């Protein structure tokens, strides 16, 4: 889709792997991105990773092996802020 937003959740001890808790395309994606800023949640532009997550990991699912390293990196960039 033209717009994609993937919301990832990780909490040490609770989520063994990062969890996709919310997703959106097009209007809903734009709403997620705007509300994220409003609520001070880090938003990273990563076209390939967002696109592949959207295609492969549905809302409510843990990420799979192919995504472990790139998403771990994403989280550390976000957490480093």
């Amino acid at each position: 889709p033209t717009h994609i937003a993937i919301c990832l959740y990780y909490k040490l001890g609770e989520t063994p792997l990062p969890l996709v808790i919310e997703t959106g395309k097009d209007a809903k994606a734009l709403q997620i991105i705007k509300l994220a800023e409003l609520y001070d949640i880090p938003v990273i532009e990563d076209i390939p990773l967002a696109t592949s997550l959207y295609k492969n990991i549905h809302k409510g699912q843990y990420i799979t092996e192919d995504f472990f390293e790139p998403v771990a990196q994403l989280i550390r960039i976000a957490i480093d802020l």
Partner: peptide
Amino acid sequence: IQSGSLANNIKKSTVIVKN
């Protein structure tokens, strides 16, 4: 019209990735 859970899910998120 957004679902009632959208805002809570965003606020809970560790990071959001976009295209």
